[PDB]
Amino acid sequence: FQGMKPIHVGLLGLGTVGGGTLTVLRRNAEEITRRAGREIRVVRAAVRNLDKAEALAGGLPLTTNPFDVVDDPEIDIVVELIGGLEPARELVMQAIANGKHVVTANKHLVAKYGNEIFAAAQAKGVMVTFEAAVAGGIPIIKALREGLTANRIEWLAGIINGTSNFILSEMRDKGAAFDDVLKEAQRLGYAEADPTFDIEGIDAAHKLTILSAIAFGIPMQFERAYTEGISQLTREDVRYAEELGYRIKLLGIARRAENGIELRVHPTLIPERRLIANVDGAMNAVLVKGDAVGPTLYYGAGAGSEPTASAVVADLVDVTRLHTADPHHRVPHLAFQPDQLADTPILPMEAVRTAYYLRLRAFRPGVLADITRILADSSISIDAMVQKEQVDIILLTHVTLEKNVNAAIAKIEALDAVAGKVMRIRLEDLG
Amino acid sequence: FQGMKPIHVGLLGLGTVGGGTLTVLRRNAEEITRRAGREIRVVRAAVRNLDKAEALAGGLPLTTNPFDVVDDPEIDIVVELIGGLEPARELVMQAIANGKHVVTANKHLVAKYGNEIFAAAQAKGVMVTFEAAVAGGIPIIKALREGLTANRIEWLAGIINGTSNFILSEMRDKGAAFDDVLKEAQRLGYAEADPTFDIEGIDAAHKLTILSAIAFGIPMQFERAYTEGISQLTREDVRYAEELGYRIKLLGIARRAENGIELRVHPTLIPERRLIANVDGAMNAVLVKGDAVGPTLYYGAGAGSEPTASAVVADLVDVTRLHTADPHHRVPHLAFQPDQLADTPILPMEAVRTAYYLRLRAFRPGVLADITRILADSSISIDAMVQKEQVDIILLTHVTLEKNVNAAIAKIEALDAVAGKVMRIRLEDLG
Amino acid sequence: FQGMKPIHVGLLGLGTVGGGTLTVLRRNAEEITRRAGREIRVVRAAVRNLDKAEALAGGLPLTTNPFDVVDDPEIDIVVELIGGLEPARELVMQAIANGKHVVTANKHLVAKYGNEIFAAAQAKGVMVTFEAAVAGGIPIIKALREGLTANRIEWLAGIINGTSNFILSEMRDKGAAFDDVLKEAQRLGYAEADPTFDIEGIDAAHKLTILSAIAFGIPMQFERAYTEGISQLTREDVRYAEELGYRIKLLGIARRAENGIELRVHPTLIPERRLIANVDGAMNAVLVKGDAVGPTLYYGAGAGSEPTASAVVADLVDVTRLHTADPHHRVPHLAFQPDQLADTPILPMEAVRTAYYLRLRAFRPGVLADITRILADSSISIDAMVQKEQVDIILLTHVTLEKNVNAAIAKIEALDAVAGKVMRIRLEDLG
Amino acid sequence: FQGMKPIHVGLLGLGTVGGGTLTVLRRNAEEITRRAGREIRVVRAAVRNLDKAEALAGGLPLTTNPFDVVDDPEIDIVVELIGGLEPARELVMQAIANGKHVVTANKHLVAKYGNEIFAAAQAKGVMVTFEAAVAGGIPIIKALREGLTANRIEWLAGIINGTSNFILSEMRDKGAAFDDVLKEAQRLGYAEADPTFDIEGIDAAHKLTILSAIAFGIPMQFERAYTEGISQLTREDVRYAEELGYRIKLLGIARRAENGIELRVHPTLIPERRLIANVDGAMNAVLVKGDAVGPTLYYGAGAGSEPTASAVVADLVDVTRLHTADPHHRVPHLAFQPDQLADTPILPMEAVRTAYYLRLRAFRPGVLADITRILADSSISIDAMVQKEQVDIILLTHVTLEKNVNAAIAKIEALDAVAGKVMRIRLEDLG
């Protein structure tokens, strides 16, 4: 008979997400078995800290040797929840060498080594899945890879890092400085003691790289992504943006341009009318533009215990279904297809077109005349200017090639009348 | 070799969506073949009007006999785009009898005859899919059935009829009467000459029934759905709701309650802060609450040529993959599972708990005293009242059993001081 | 010749206003002499503290004996700037006994002893003037007594205490508690160490009494004025009033009612659209309703050095003109006319009609039913109610006789479900 | 005895104001007699149309010969209500030649011939008064001449034409074009069939000239006043001003500048926070800045039957008091003093400093560069710019000498890229 042999799952790492995963599998067992066609049974977890893992494990057998999982011939699927590059990279490659599928939440590993991992998986005939790696419990990979298969994806924009969104939301709502919002976030447990990956846009850029690979059918190319974080943003910027009709978000943009693909993470002004502009707190959202369907939006929690577990288990079900149905690979199994890739190049940030919020400090009437002539020389059109013995002057530009703005900014900063730098923050309509 | 035999598709009906489907299949052929594992090839379309179909067909062979499609042994998948109950019901059943899969956009047929259709499909071992039947190009069925498989769904709320949303959006923005917004919508082609299914909530209730079946694993039970449309709504109501902090939408709610399932379509006040409250024009959105993932939202176009085609083709790909991989049914194929159903009863509207906007016309100081005593007698708590020789009095109630409100309203309407009826409109926080 | 003999002025008290007066007389000497028809020359000031007075006097002779001023046969006009009741009352009466005119800023003295003072002045044939006693530099007495002589005054409403207005403005703008706004005001010198007369409405009620005497031609009847201050007002009250469409001001109202005259000072909600509702900081405004002219408004500073001096000097000019023109009293000289008085009674507060903001704390659905029945029993109509295990409930009533509200409040406070008192604050449309 | 001989008054013209005057004198007879010291008795009215005058006269004797009034030896005071220049000028001069006082509402006559009229009045020893000529029932002349006598007036700004304010209020509230607001105003009787004096700022400039004479002690110099009306103002202008934080009013400004006096009427942007900016409908307001008192504001109706009558009667009382007290002129009687005048010159508009709203239509990025260089060349500083194949560009300038703006505008209009003219509207903070 079919449906009587359980599929056997092993975990690498446990933690919050692992504990969540065990809880979700047990609690929803009935529905999971129904959809999967057989029971999904967790056999053991390899963990570094045995004592801390006990509280989260609910009596699941634990071991400190990860090869008790990746080399156990009885284990069919490995769930990788270690995070980091090593030893996750080594264990994942070994799991694959042994003919095991891998379900992972590891956006860092997948963004950096996805090409080599998927290539090795396809050669071996196993699946590696990563729904839980991007936007938490939001089924965005399934939406992109399966829901929107009939679409050419023109672009997507995402709020996909909860901590940096929480900070930017709090700054706007409360009016406080970045520094003390970051400190308050750490105290209340919204930001970790070392928040570099969050506030510098690195986490978001890992995830965007993955989204870009699946949206456009290209290799993972994290090194080529432009990233800028939020730490240089001031109270004034948030307030001026508000008065000008915009919200500020840390956005990942992946977009087909004329001569390449944009892959960029940066603070960006979004008109306040847009739904994505009003996605606050620790919530995530991905806005996707397909040629047939138009803009579609997926919104929810992008991190946290049970939301992440939800995506891990969905991947467990998907992998289980295809493992059982199709061991001879009559149909493609991998969401990332090494034999179906396009070589479209990623654009440098300077080759990308965008609009700008510009804020500078200057000392005369001739000051504006020089600034505007510099802008015209670089073919930059102004949408608005506001001047709120030095005055703060704010400029909103039309859409323009970034190289132009770089060159123009250097001339403006060369003006005797200009002390300090020109703070740039990019602006995207998304309409 | 695998992948060399095309799957052969036949259409019933063509129209806007059919033309769209042919265009999308041709334009995205490369990606579709990649994901499906073989070419998906449309062989012919059965159409009623040969001349009108010519302009939309792009040279695809046409026939006026639908059995040239459903009885042709070479056709593997039938795409049903007729709409209506008959002859769609008969042709669909015959397609199934002949061992063909069916991809349909027909929410009316699926909501009314889904139980018998899926039962017949499971017995035969074929698939019937209906992604295009609910929320157009938004992959909500895939999200509910596959993305959220690890979740118990607690409730969902949807804006899933584009025309009724367009009218309610226009009324709010422009301040005009329902009558002339409806007329203006018909003139500009946003509403059809007979808009009954749209403005009466029937279309939305077809779709909600389908959503409820997949969310909760229950039979289709359209007859048991509560439905109320928008035609009784006044300019005053939209304006008062705005001043009170709410937007008015035609919402479908499907929810697990204490003793049953709520299945209801009605105008409803939603706090203006909610994302779903700001979903305007012809856009659709479904807000889904799962136990593991929390609230997630799916937003986009819910009708139109290419959005609908997008969902049809996604279903074509899904069906093709499983047809090829798993003809022996090692795993479940149907999104609706006749052998896995729960018998949880649908609640009558009166057994449902909700909050209310109440507006009535009355003539004395004792008038309010009597009204409030009547409410207390039926255990109804007031949140707010506003009195904007007859005065219009507006009441917002706390959450309460509908039976209570029915009885209290009848006593209020019996008061000598009260001329006319008490206009009720329901209120849902969704937070 | 005319115009060659200076009129000789003596001061009682100096201080800020006195110093201001000397400065204004000197600086505008040309215009003052032109209008007066002769020079106005300050001869000396009687002061208590000789050293502190030196800095403000600009070399004007000083004496510590006030009879060097009020008994000097050469002095024609006494300017009384002592404040307080004694010795101002005694010196003023002695100045009058000696046939000298008196210009005073002393609202306390005039409100309490105006009847006896003006009677003594008319018998003697001298003038006592008090422009500087009410609303500082705003020429409201001249406007009421001379500008609006062709009008029956129906009512006036005034913001006439700068300190209490500053506090209420700050509370609204900044959201802070009364306590710390009062403390911050004292630290920055907007409120004096003992602010009783300001925050309790006593100063405003002195001034309103004076305004009422001139508006309606009645005796001064300060004892019969209703007064309530601001110290019981909470942050919640200011915020709720804001959300409901109102601003809160400490208002003096003097009004002809059906059976009497209203004379009342209290916190009051004024619709936010009204100009007087937006009179903030330390500014004063008096809104006057005449039968011929309609509503007229006079706005400006209501205290401070030079604004007060401005009014003192205007009075000096008026007195000088009539002293010179008309020593035989062919025309009336006094602004308050003891031989032309009406005996219209002042209403007790309970006999006055007004609308109310009511805020109470209560524990059930029957709670509102009981409250509303109590209100109907006392013939009180509700405009609005808002309910923002105890809940805060807010009621706006229609216009009603105060006695009714007193009785109804006592029944509401007797309800078991009601803990604490019902905070009342009155509400006036002024439209 | 004093007080037994009535003063005898004759009218020239009757109309709305005349009828009002008779009604007010009769209705308030008690108070008027009290303050005046004797009865004020209207003997007859000279009118052009006997039949139309009957309805307004209440049985007062009427005659068509105005010399039955101005040559009747028994008449002490003439009330001139004809309007226009002739025959009012001739009759007024004849009244003066005959030793009669004149009370007038005729702002046109007083603004144009005030110098010659007051000179003739002072020589004869009679009074000419004109309270009713400016700002209707608001006692602004009394406030300026008597209330603020201790002040050097630095500047005043007035909304003093009801019709032009009604139009500008309606345009802002309703969003309609000037043309149809003007037409609708004429239909509802807010604007007369020939509205030239109202919409062109002529009426306001008559009144401002009078205000300027009394504020600054200078001759009437109407010919030297700058005037601009409202008819060139567009819907866009009102809306852009609103979005930028301003209201648009037709303002009269009289101000002491460095080298002269500003005397100007024009549309002007006032920040929306100012009380005067929110003075809407047919209401008038004069904002007065004195050195001692600071800014003071007088608000009310500036036209209409009984408001105007109110001011006429106040003048009747003033004239009566001084006629009785002081026939030997011990003190000055005239509000305008021909023997006390300063020769300070009126500035041409081009010699005046003000800020600007500038709106122009233009076609390139170099367009803004040229505009800003032109502005810098004329020493003009920009506060803000907004750009809402031609684009509308809006500029707010800092305060600058008008000559500079004229020259800069001519260069901007010379740019090939600029089609049409630069619409200027002036901007005044008034803070």
PDB file of N, CA, C and O in Angstrom, chain B residues 283-321:
ATOM      1  N   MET B 283      -9.908  46.437  -7.580  1.00  0.00           N
ATOM      2  CA  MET B 283      -8.962  45.479  -6.984  1.00  0.00           C
ATOM      3  C   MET B 283      -9.655  44.534  -6.010  1.00  0.00           C
ATOM      4  O   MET B 283     -10.683  44.882  -5.431  1.00  0.00           O
ATOM      5  N   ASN B 284      -9.088  43.335  -5.858  1.00  0.00           N
ATOM      6  CA  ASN B 284      -9.539  42.332  -4.904  1.00  0.00           C
ATOM      7  C   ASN B 284      -8.464  42.166  -3.833  1.00  0.00           C
ATOM      8  O   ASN B 284      -7.296  42.477  -4.063  1.00  0.00           O
ATOM      9  N   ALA B 285      -8.865  41.692  -2.664  1.00  0.00           N
ATOM     10  CA  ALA B 285      -7.916  41.308  -1.606  1.00  0.00           C
ATOM     11  C   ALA B 285      -8.559  40.260  -0.730  1.00  0.00           C
ATOM     12  O   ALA B 285      -9.758  40.329  -0.438  1.00  0.00           O
ATOM     13  N   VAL B 286      -7.766  39.269  -0.335  1.00  0.00           N
ATOM     14  CA  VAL B 286      -8.201  38.295   0.672  1.00  0.00           C
ATOM     15  C   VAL B 286      -7.250  38.331   1.852  1.00  0.00           C
ATOM     16  O   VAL B 286      -6.032  38.213   1.691  1.00  0.00           O
ATOM     17  N   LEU B 287      -7.819  38.554   3.029  1.00  0.00           N
ATOM     18  CA  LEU B 287      -7.079  38.568   4.274  1.00  0.00           C
ATOM     19  C   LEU B 287      -7.322  37.207   4.946  1.00  0.00           C
ATOM     20  O   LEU B 287      -8.467  36.816   5.160  1.00  0.00           O
ATOM     21  N   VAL B 288      -6.239  36.491   5.244  1.00  0.00           N
ATOM     22  CA  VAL B 288      -6.335  35.132   5.787  1.00  0.00           C
ATOM     23  C   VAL B 288      -5.645  35.053   7.157  1.00  0.00           C
ATOM     24  O   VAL B 288      -4.502  35.495   7.304  1.00  0.00           O
ATOM     25  N   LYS B 289      -6.358  34.520   8.150  1.00  0.00           N
ATOM     26  CA  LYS B 289      -5.804  34.316   9.492  1.00  0.00           C
ATOM     27  C   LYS B 289      -5.540  32.832   9.786  1.00  0.00           C
ATOM     28  O   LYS B 289      -6.476  32.051   9.986  1.00  0.00           O
ATOM     29  N   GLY B 290      -4.262  32.467   9.827  1.00  0.00           N
ATOM     30  CA  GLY B 290      -3.831  31.121  10.194  1.00  0.00           C
ATOM     31  C   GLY B 290      -3.235  31.110  11.587  1.00  0.00           C
ATOM     32  O   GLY B 290      -2.722  32.141  12.067  1.00  0.00           O
ATOM     33  N   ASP B 291      -3.281  29.953  12.247  1.00  0.00           N
ATOM     34  CA  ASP B 291      -2.837  29.889  13.636  1.00  0.00           C
ATOM     35  C   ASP B 291      -1.324  30.034  13.769  1.00  0.00           C
ATOM     36  O   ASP B 291      -0.842  30.668  14.718  1.00  0.00           O
ATOM     37  N   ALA B 292      -0.582  29.488  12.810  1.00  0.00           N
ATOM     38  CA  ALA B 292       0.885  29.549  12.848  1.00  0.00           C
ATOM     39  C   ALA B 292       1.416  30.852  12.246  1.00  0.00           C
ATOM     40  O   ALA B 292       2.332  31.466  12.779  1.00  0.00           O
ATOM     41  N   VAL B 293       0.834  31.266  11.127  1.00  0.00           N
ATOM     42  CA  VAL B 293       1.382  32.380  10.371  1.00  0.00           C
ATOM     43  C   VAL B 293       0.805  33.771  10.788  1.00  0.00           C
ATOM     44  O   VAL B 293       1.464  34.803  10.590  1.00  0.00           O
ATOM     45  N   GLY B 294      -0.378  33.785  11.404  1.00  0.00           N
ATOM     46  CA  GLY B 294      -1.054  35.042  11.739  1.00  0.00           C
ATOM     47  C   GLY B 294      -1.821  35.546  10.518  1.00  0.00           C
ATOM     48  O   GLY B 294      -2.153  34.757   9.625  1.00  0.00           O
ATOM     49  N   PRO B 295      -2.105  36.859  10.463  1.00  0.00           N
ATOM     50  CA  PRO B 295      -2.798  37.402   9.296  1.00  0.00           C
ATOM     51  C   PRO B 295      -1.857  37.574   8.084  1.00  0.00           C
ATOM     52  O   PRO B 295      -0.725  38.069   8.219  1.00  0.00           O
ATOM     53  N   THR B 296      -2.300  37.093   6.932  1.00  0.00           N
ATOM     54  CA  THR B 296      -1.584  37.337   5.687  1.00  0.00           C
ATOM     55  C   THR B 296      -2.579  37.894   4.672  1.00  0.00           C
ATOM     56  O   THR B 296      -3.767  37.568   4.721  1.00  0.00           O
ATOM     57  N   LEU B 297      -2.086  38.734   3.760  1.00  0.00           N
ATOM     58  CA  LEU B 297      -2.948  39.395   2.806  1.00  0.00           C
ATOM     59  C   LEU B 297      -2.427  39.225   1.389  1.00  0.00           C
ATOM     60  O   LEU B 297      -1.214  39.369   1.133  1.00  0.00           O
ATOM     61  N   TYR B 298      -3.362  38.917   0.492  1.00  0.00           N
ATOM     62  CA  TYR B 298      -3.102  38.716  -0.927  1.00  0.00           C
ATOM     63  C   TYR B 298      -3.937  39.730  -1.697  1.00  0.00           C
ATOM     64  O   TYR B 298      -5.154  39.792  -1.544  1.00  0.00           O
ATOM     65  N   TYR B 299      -3.278  40.540  -2.514  1.00  0.00           N
ATOM     66  CA  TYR B 299      -3.923  41.687  -3.145  1.00  0.00           C
ATOM     67  C   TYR B 299      -3.583  41.723  -4.622  1.00  0.00           C
ATOM     68  O   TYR B 299      -2.459  41.379  -5.003  1.00  0.00           O
ATOM     69  N   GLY B 300      -4.556  42.134  -5.445  1.00  0.00           N
ATOM     70  CA  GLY B 300      -4.349  42.312  -6.888  1.00  0.00           C
ATOM     71  C   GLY B 300      -5.650  42.496  -7.640  1.00  0.00           C
ATOM     72  O   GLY B 300      -6.685  42.807  -7.039  1.00  0.00           O
ATOM     73  N   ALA B 301      -5.603  42.328  -8.961  1.00  0.00           N
ATOM     74  CA  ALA B 301      -6.816  42.354  -9.773  1.00  0.00           C
ATOM     75  C   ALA B 301      -7.576  41.036  -9.597  1.00  0.00           C
ATOM     76  O   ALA B 301      -6.965  39.953  -9.551  1.00  0.00           O
ATOM     77  N   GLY B 302      -8.899  41.144  -9.493  1.00  0.00           N
ATOM     78  CA  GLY B 302      -9.758  39.991  -9.227  1.00  0.00           C
ATOM     79  C   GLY B 302     -10.635  39.583 -10.392  1.00  0.00           C
ATOM     80  O   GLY B 302     -11.430  38.645 -10.276  1.00  0.00           O
ATOM     81  N   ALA B 303     -10.470  40.289 -11.510  1.00  0.00           N
ATOM     82  CA  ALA B 303     -11.147  39.998 -12.782  1.00  0.00           C
ATOM     83  C   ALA B 303     -10.290  40.537 -13.937  1.00  0.00           C
ATOM     84  O   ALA B 303      -9.139  40.930 -13.724  1.00  0.00           O
ATOM     85  N   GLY B 304     -10.845  40.570 -15.149  1.00  0.00           N
ATOM     86  CA  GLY B 304     -10.111  41.057 -16.320  1.00  0.00           C
ATOM     87  C   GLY B 304      -9.423  39.955 -17.124  1.00  0.00           C
ATOM     88  O   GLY B 304      -9.109  38.892 -16.611  1.00  0.00           O
ATOM     89  N   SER B 305      -9.161  40.258 -18.386  1.00  0.00           N
ATOM     90  CA  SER B 305      -8.709  39.297 -19.376  1.00  0.00           C
ATOM     91  C   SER B 305      -7.482  38.498 -18.926  1.00  0.00           C
ATOM     92  O   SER B 305      -7.562  37.286 -18.676  1.00  0.00           O
ATOM     93  N   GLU B 306      -6.357  39.199 -18.799  1.00  0.00           N
ATOM     94  CA  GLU B 306      -5.062  38.553 -18.642  1.00  0.00           C
ATOM     95  C   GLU B 306      -4.808  38.106 -17.221  1.00  0.00           C
ATOM     96  O   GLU B 306      -4.163  37.079 -17.027  1.00  0.00           O
ATOM     97  N   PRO B 307      -5.333  38.857 -16.222  1.00  0.00           N
ATOM     98  CA  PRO B 307      -5.265  38.329 -14.853  1.00  0.00           C
ATOM     99  C   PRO B 307      -5.959  36.975 -14.708  1.00  0.00           C
ATOM    100  O   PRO B 307      -5.438  36.083 -14.041  1.00  0.00           O
ATOM    101  N   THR B 308      -7.118  36.817 -15.329  1.00  0.00           N
ATOM    102  CA  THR B 308      -7.862  35.549 -15.227  1.00  0.00           C
ATOM    103  C   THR B 308      -7.114  34.453 -15.992  1.00  0.00           C
ATOM    104  O   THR B 308      -6.945  33.336 -15.486  1.00  0.00           O
ATOM    105  N   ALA B 309      -6.631  34.800 -17.185  1.00  0.00           N
ATOM    106  CA  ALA B 309      -5.852  33.889 -18.019  1.00  0.00           C
ATOM    107  C   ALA B 309      -4.642  33.395 -17.232  1.00  0.00           C
ATOM    108  O   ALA B 309      -4.297  32.204 -17.278  1.00  0.00           O
ATOM    109  N   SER B 310      -4.017  34.309 -16.491  1.00  0.00           N
ATOM    110  CA  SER B 310      -2.836  33.972 -15.698  1.00  0.00           C
ATOM    111  C   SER B 310      -3.111  32.794 -14.762  1.00  0.00           C
ATOM    112  O   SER B 310      -2.280  31.890 -14.646  1.00  0.00           O
ATOM    113  N   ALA B 311      -4.275  32.817 -14.108  1.00  0.00           N
ATOM    114  CA  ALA B 311      -4.687  31.775 -13.175  1.00  0.00           C
ATOM    115  C   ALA B 311      -5.087  30.487 -13.885  1.00  0.00           C
ATOM    116  O   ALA B 311      -4.845  29.396 -13.359  1.00  0.00           O
ATOM    117  N   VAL B 312      -5.727  30.613 -15.051  1.00  0.00           N
ATOM    118  CA  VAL B 312      -6.068  29.459 -15.870  1.00  0.00           C
ATOM    119  C   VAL B 312      -4.791  28.689 -16.254  1.00  0.00           C
ATOM    120  O   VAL B 312      -4.739  27.464 -16.115  1.00  0.00           O
ATOM    121  N   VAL B 313      -3.768  29.419 -16.702  1.00  0.00           N
ATOM    122  CA  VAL B 313      -2.540  28.813 -17.176  1.00  0.00           C
ATOM    123  C   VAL B 313      -1.725  28.188 -16.026  1.00  0.00           C
ATOM    124  O   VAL B 313      -1.147  27.104 -16.185  1.00  0.00           O
ATOM    125  N   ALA B 314      -1.716  28.847 -14.864  1.00  0.00           N
ATOM    126  CA  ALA B 314      -1.104  28.283 -13.680  1.00  0.00           C
ATOM    127  C   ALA B 314      -1.746  26.928 -13.351  1.00  0.00           C
ATOM    128  O   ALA B 314      -1.039  25.965 -13.038  1.00  0.00           O
ATOM    129  N   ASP B 315      -3.076  26.865 -13.428  1.00  0.00           N
ATOM    130  CA  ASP B 315      -3.809  25.615 -13.240  1.00  0.00           C
ATOM    131  C   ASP B 315      -3.439  24.591 -14.334  1.00  0.00           C
ATOM    132  O   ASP B 315      -3.152  23.433 -14.033  1.00  0.00           O
ATOM    133  N   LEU B 316      -3.396  25.024 -15.589  1.00  0.00           N
ATOM    134  CA  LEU B 316      -2.907  24.137 -16.652  1.00  0.00           C
ATOM    135  C   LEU B 316      -1.533  23.527 -16.336  1.00  0.00           C
ATOM    136  O   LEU B 316      -1.304  22.320 -16.539  1.00  0.00           O
ATOM    137  N   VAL B 317      -0.619  24.355 -15.849  1.00  0.00           N
ATOM    138  CA  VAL B 317       0.715  23.857 -15.485  1.00  0.00           C
ATOM    139  C   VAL B 317       0.607  22.851 -14.341  1.00  0.00           C
ATOM    140  O   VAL B 317       1.153  21.759 -14.466  1.00  0.00           O
ATOM    141  N   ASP B 318      -0.111  23.190 -13.258  1.00  0.00           N
ATOM    142  CA  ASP B 318      -0.274  22.257 -12.115  1.00  0.00           C
ATOM    143  C   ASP B 318      -0.831  20.899 -12.508  1.00  0.00           C
ATOM    144  O   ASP B 318      -0.339  19.859 -12.044  1.00  0.00           O
ATOM    145  N   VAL B 319      -1.861  20.932 -13.353  1.00  0.00           N
ATOM    146  CA  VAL B 319      -2.554  19.731 -13.772  1.00  0.00           C
ATOM    147  C   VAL B 319      -1.613  18.894 -14.634  1.00  0.00           C
ATOM    148  O   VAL B 319      -1.492  17.688 -14.439  1.00  0.00           O
ATOM    149  N   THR B 320      -0.923  19.549 -15.557  1.00  0.00           N
ATOM    150  CA  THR B 320       0.028  18.894 -16.444  1.00  0.00           C
ATOM    151  C   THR B 320       1.144  18.188 -15.654  1.00  0.00           C
ATOM    152  O   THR B 320       1.490  17.038 -15.949  1.00  0.00           O
ATOM    153  N   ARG B 321       1.693  18.873 -14.656  1.00  0.00           N
ATOM    154  CA  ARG B 321       2.773  18.302 -13.842  1.00  0.00           C
ATOM    155  C   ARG B 321       2.331  16.994 -13.171  1.00  0.00           C
ATOM    156  O   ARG B 321       3.024  15.969 -13.282  1.00  0.00           O
TER     157      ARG B 321
END
